Symmetry: D2
Subunit: 243 residues, 4 copies
């Protein structure tokens, strides 16, 4: 029982790898740092039950993953852009940076998904879980480029599911905010930066950051297919900040 | 054992919830209109080992009646429904009494239930309150112009009340079913007997089939577990991809 | 004679509707609870040119009352409101009578009005029915957990009822205001007296200012013109960019 | 008053050009055919009052427009791709084609908007109206690439308006479907296709295509700024098919 998780060392990657492995999955992992063999060896040694791909092209991850087993049960498309690039404004941002936002958050997941459909269909189905953002559904003033690129991939889920669900290929979008994770809300920020707390207690009904095991629980629940009729929609993971 | 309260237990999502929570280790305390009769209460408790059939019919009294059977309520499934074909009542020609009954059953009844539940649920340190609504709580349909508004009010109640209740650990959710195999709207016999339903599902449901009772059950017990608490306060389509 | 019906004319979006509709050449027939007093009707009619102040108070009877003054209704502005601070009524501690009054004024009253209007508006070859709701009809607010649901029901009424009434030429719309300069929620007095309001608007309203009466009027008369019919059946935020 | 209308020969272009001209604007027009001088001359003589730009690059249209007047009052970002590219599926579609969908429908309007902010702000404000699609908000099975690109630009309007509205630069998105226009619903289609008239009868509450003058009325109403507080949102133009 196999899962592919992209950008494994960032965003929702750590929560997904830990939860899927604890659930009995062999978790095949992609990451930019894995072009270095030393990084692959360290990740695998330090993460029992994982395989660290060398492959870096989005349209080649799936075939690479199939080197390690006969079928993929779950793909976690864990796409991200580092801070502070997610807060790039419109004015003054370079064309290169505009393109890079869409490349990482919109084009990469599409090329991945495209490459997955035929093997996933042939194996009788699978789950594809796209990790997006709260701004995939609800805008924020300081994410005017990031937001559009995230909204594209949420729309991708909603449209693609209309055809892929009949093949047993079940697509979902998760939109986090105030989620304890190394990319946007690392534990070091929570404990050292008094500004984060104060706004969580004001803006987040739950009153705290979402925990890694709570993101893991959502991912393994979707991955179980036990509630497949919720296929094809966006889930806020924001502690009640959305809607 | 965890205590759950399920309203209208014989209808809509009731049977799926009562079965899933019972198999998940809960004592399921159940409300139903038919339980005004002591005999139906006995037969229900007989056919569903573990459950308790409440006599109380008023929404504001269900929580206290449930608390006669345990120390704290872990989960409330507010499984509101109105007898068919009232969900399809049009605007023209419908009596004032029917309009009011639509809002009474689908909007006022759950508000009075939730109102009565806040204080005891806060004192016990939280709970899950899951409202069974409808796909038309989020996306309108031509033939539900009164039922839709009433469902949308209760989805909005979830979205708004969760802004304050989540801090108490009282976690609210709405489920919006369609094409869900259930005794009210899509009984198994309709799937078995009517070729038009199969055709319509093939056309309109990406998943290609009705949602199963145990799939609704799995969503409800996943929510009741609180393991993914940060998804609190939103609406979940349960439609096989028909929504959005 | 080009006739508009505006409800609760003294409140909320009423004054803006009356003024812009009158400017645009409509005979504006107005309902308002104060008009049960004959002194108020005469006064309103002399402060407001060419307007007609209805004595009628029942929602189902406003259309027939209006059709005593002309042959057909071109536009209905269903300007439903409740007095502050009922919009901020919490769930806890609120009386059942108050809960019911919120739905009565904001959900039942527009339905009864709409139901009564379909047959005569259809006979006449169409019309516009514009519901003034609120931003919480689409986006929840922590302190509007009852007002919100009642408003969301009426937005859903527009969305669903439009699926059938649009073929009759009866075009339904919902406007959802916030930070709108009006005597009910954001009076020009409140702006000048509460620096915390001006600070909240600077922080949360992209426009940076309250919406003006003539801007609400411009939206109302544009919809009433039917010049852009294909936008029928949806919700329009009137919030200065606060929504979405 | 000066308006810029892009892709003026397609989609909502002819409706925009006619309505704004009739409302007293000099309408400066972009179009890919205007690289041909003979096409510019034909267009200008056939559309009195308009100016056909030779410029083709999205980030240069604003400066090209301001050679013809002191300030831009309205920009109509009339983005489109030739049909049936709107119906491209995920499987089989080339990477170049995936990229062109986003280029025309997402990147082009961003590069245009970016270039416009400073001159529009210096002139005291303006209106920027993005013509998107109904799939910018609600998914369709046959638009799994077009949908995401449209959804990005809808999200661009919603997010960028949070900051540009303060400058008096008012952004809107219009999302048409079943709109009588030369690209997706030409009148010849209505006459030729009984399936279309049947689908419109079943799915469109208005029971008819939206007229060009009705799109024009919406554009000129928005361009007037008379109802500025509705800034920053998506308007369905679908005869009630949405929501
Ligand atoms: Cl996050
Ligand atoms: Cl159902
Ligand atoms: Cl207001
Ligand atoms: Cl169109």
């Amino acid at each position: 029982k196999i899962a592919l998780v992209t950008h494994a060392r960032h965003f929702a990657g750590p929560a997904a790898v830990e939860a899927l492995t604890r659930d009995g999955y062999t978790v095949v992992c992609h990451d930019a740092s894995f072009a270095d063999a030393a990084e692959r060896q360290r990740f695998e040694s330090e993460n029992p039950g994982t395989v660290a791909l060398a492959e870096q092209k989005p349209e080649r991850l799936v075939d690479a993953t199939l080197q390690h087993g006969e079928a993929i049960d779950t793909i976690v498309s864990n796409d991200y852009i580092p801070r502070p690039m997610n807060r790039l404004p419109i004015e003054g941002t370079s064309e290169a940076d505009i393109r890079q936002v869409f490349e990482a958050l919109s084009i990469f997941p599409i090329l991945l998904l495209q490459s997955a459909i035929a093997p996933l269909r042939a194996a009788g189905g699978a789950s594809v879980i796209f990790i997006t953002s709260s701004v995939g559904k609800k805008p924020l003033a300081y994410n005017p480029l990031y937001g559009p690129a995230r909204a594209a991939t949420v729309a991708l889920v909603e449209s693609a599911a209309k055809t892929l669900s009949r093949d047993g290929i079940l697509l979902y979008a998760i939109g986090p905010n105030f989620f304890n994770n190394p990319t946007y809300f690392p534990t070091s920020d929570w404990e050292n930066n008094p500004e984060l707390r104060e706004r969580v207690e004001r803006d987040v009904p739950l009153g705290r950051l979402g925990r890694p095991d709570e993101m893991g629980a959502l991912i393994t629940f979707l991955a179980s297919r036990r509630a497949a009729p919720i296929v094809g929609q966006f889930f806020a993971f924001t502690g009640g900040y959305l809607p």
